[PDB]
């Protein structure tokens, strides 16, 4: 028989992909970026009017 | 009657073709071949990284 040094190999190239998550709600909801310079002086707040009745 | 020499006939090229088998699962399965030299000095074992979280 052949008795020799043993090694432990790891295959960094082959990764066992396990998880795949979808994010539809964050894609449907709209994104807005108010001007940062005005946001800083306000408390990071914008006020929007509501439709009048 | 007619006592003459007898023969035994084997239709060699006429095989009966009794079996048909199919292999779906091993066809659908992945097939991996690591480097052989590194495999020998391991216990025929490779470690594979899992996707990080």
From Swiss-Prot, chains A, B:
It comes from the Viruses. The record marks 13 as: Essential for binding to the capsid assembly scaffolding protein. Transmembrane segments: none annotated. Residues 1-53 are annotated as: Binding to the capsid assembly scaffolding protein. Changing residue 17 to A: Decreased phage growth. Interacts (via N-terminus) with the capsid assembly scaffolding protein (via C-terminus); capsid proteins and scaffolding proteins form building blocks that assemble to form the procapsid. Interacts with the portal protein. Self-assembles to form an icosahedral capsid with a T=7 symmetry. The insertion domain (I domain) plays an important role in the folding of the capsid protein by acting as an intramolecular chaperone. Belongs to the P22 phage major capsid protein family. This is Major capsid protein. The lineage of its organism: Viruses, Duplodnaviria, Heunggongvirae, Uroviricota, Caudoviricetes. The chain holds residues 2 to 54 of 430 of the full protein.
């Amino acid at each position: 028989a052949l008795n020799e040094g043993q090694i432990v190999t790891l295959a960094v190239d082959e990764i066992i992909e396990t998880i795949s998550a979808i994010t539809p709600m964050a894609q449907k909801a709209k994104k807005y970026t108010p001007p940062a310079a005005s946001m800083q002086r306000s408390s990071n707040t914008i006020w929007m009017p509501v439709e009048q009745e």
